[PDB]
Structure 1
Amino acid sequence: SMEVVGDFEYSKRDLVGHGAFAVVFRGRHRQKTDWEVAIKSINKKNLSKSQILLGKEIKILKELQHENIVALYDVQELPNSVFLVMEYCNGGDLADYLQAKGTLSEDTIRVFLHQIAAAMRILHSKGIIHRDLKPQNILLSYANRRKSSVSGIRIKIADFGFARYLHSNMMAADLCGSPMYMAPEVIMSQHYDAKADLWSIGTVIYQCLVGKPPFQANSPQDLRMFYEKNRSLMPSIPRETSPYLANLLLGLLQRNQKDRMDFEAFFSHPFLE
């Protein structure tokens, strides 16, 4: 028995991901049954009862068409739910890949990072920050399942439910009428978390190289305590790390935004050249 979602369907057995307000299944087109898709169901009702915002995943994915970002094929709205029918990544996530491979060569890291960079370029041009990049939403796709070496891997960024537009506060002000009462830091907020994704990518590269994240703690509150109590974070970089990768990690893993590497510097960095 299959659940039908417009022109698509899925089995409840083929769960590939979940979060607090969403589940994602492998499915397929009902007629072209070789066309595999990912079907995400978002619980709008539960979300409406929570402090966590609904977000703009549909608009953001609709606006992006890029080979390193999951495509959106269709949307079905219900009163309490919304379904997004998206590109299926047949290789799973980067966490699964690390589980199998342990740590990756620098050359593999470079190949992946080039694709991540290409995605970050389109996000940057559109003023979109993802804000939740991690191994679990950096996905692997094999266009030909026979060519399953590193060169056969295409990387695709997914799960944009936490993503935001940098210009949204300035757009709100334009629409509100008089902005003369709004706090300066609200008017100027574009310039605060603009480099959040660069830190994340830092932590992911680190984990690829070393086999754990650069900074671990018991719980989320404990890690928050750590970042708060240590204002100059030094990542522990293995001494055998190449000069350029060491340099790239040090520039990405700056606790303070203002010290962190710029996007133009990231995209130009010699590790990537």
Structure 2
Amino acid sequence: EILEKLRSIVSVGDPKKKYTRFEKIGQGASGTVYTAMDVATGQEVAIKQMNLQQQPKKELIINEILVMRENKNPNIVNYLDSYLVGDELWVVMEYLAGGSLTDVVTETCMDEGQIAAVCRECLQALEFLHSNQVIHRNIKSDNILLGMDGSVKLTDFGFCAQITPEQSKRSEMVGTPYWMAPEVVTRKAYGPKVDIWSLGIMAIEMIEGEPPYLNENPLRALYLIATNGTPELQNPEKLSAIFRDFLNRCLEMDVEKRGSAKELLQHQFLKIAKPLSSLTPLIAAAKEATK
């Protein structure tokens, strides 16, 4: 009954009177997401509402709130507060007007400059987390949020892990199959570089619209990751050499040879990044496409 630890972390007081103008903007396995407005303050917020029954290990909920409140950063969606509403947990975060990267990758064609701009900002989030001994473990386009200024922010700490010098590696088979690094899929001990792999897969989303093997069922994709290793692009000839190089460094099978987030921030690919204002036309296109 670590529900007591969860009960001591959360704020008390009715969120249903602190916040108004509730609108469902999202579903998800982890719960439903609503927008709302702080009754007093006017601030727009996103609230994730999670059924405590839905989650069998309430230990992960605790971990999610702590990591988020302890690791604030400009490239991470800001945690504001949390509340228990009966058997439902509400997490309140800053609302980022814009959209999901998923909408952009499925509905637009991104140029290398735009892709490099997104990758740089995500690598900055990862550098910060990994330096704070946190592995995200669920990097994908669905967890990247884009601001109306082209701000890029990472969210979702539902699956993350804290490591320590004593225990530098994890062994849970956690993530979303198509984005999971081979060492994770094959139950080897793994470290922060699983996030770099997932980032590589997200770069393939930005190129091709989908992670490798998405037409296949999840179990089949796990088999394909275990057997193929480094995925191949549909049309690699369409990419610059330096982009292909960046991809190769993100998607190295040899963990020790795979780029760290720090190493990758100095890659040549990132030097072609467009300014973040370059992403706002993608956001406009995606909103129009998903009317």
Aligned to 1:148: none
Aligned to 1:108: 114
Q: Does residue 22 in structure 1 map to residue 22 in structure 2? A: no
- For the aligned residues, what is the CA RMSD? 2.7
Q: Does residue 163 in structure 1 map to residue 171 in structure 2? A: no
Q: Pick the aligned partner of 1:8 from 8, 19, 41.
A: 19
Contact 1:5 1:76 in 2 (8 A): no
How far is 1:217 from its partner?
4.3
Contact 1:237 1:246 in 2 (8 A): no
Structure 1 stretches lacking a partner, 5+ long:
143-151, 172-188
Provide, for residues 8-57 of structure 1, a one-character-per-residue CA deviation record: whole Å limited to 9, x for no partner: 2342xx22222223111111111333x21001111112313x69943512
Q: Which amino acid aligns with 2:105?
A: L
Q: State TM-score, norm by structure 1.
A: 0.78
Aligned to 2:102: 95
Counterpart secondary structure, 1:77: strand
* C-alpha spacing 1:28/1:51, structure 2 compared with 1 (3 Å): closer
Number of paired residues? 240
Q: State TM-score, norm by structure 2.
A: 0.74
Q: Does residue 223 in structure 1 map to residue 221 in structure 2? A: yes
Q: Does residue 67 in structure 1 map to residue 64 in structure 2? A: no
Distance 1:163 1:130 in 2: 4
Select between 154-163 and 233-242 the one with higher mean Cα deviation: 233-242
Distance 1:155 1:253 in 2: 22
Q: Give the structure, 1 or 2, with the largest relative contact order (CA under 8 Å, sep 6 or more).
A: 2
How far is 1:191 from its partner?
6.5
Provide, for residues 188-216 of structure 1, a one-character-per-residue CA deviation record: whole Å limited to 9, x for no partner: x9972321110111011122123332343
Q: Pick the aligned partner of 1:243 from 234, 241, 244.
A: 241
Select between 63-72 and 215-224 the one with higher mean Cα deviation: 215-224
Counterpart secondary structure, 1:254: coil
Contact 1:235 1:250 in 2 (8 A): no
Q: Which amino acid aligns with 1:126?
A: N
Percent sequence identity over matched residues?
27
Contact 2:118 2:152 in 1 (8 A): yes
Q: Which amino acid aligns with 1:162?
A: F
Q: Does residue 125 in structure 1 map to residue 117 in structure 2? A: no
Contact 1:23 1:41 in 2 (8 A): yes
Q: Greater Rg, structure 1 or structure 2?
A: 1
Contact 1:214 1:236 in 2 (8 A): no
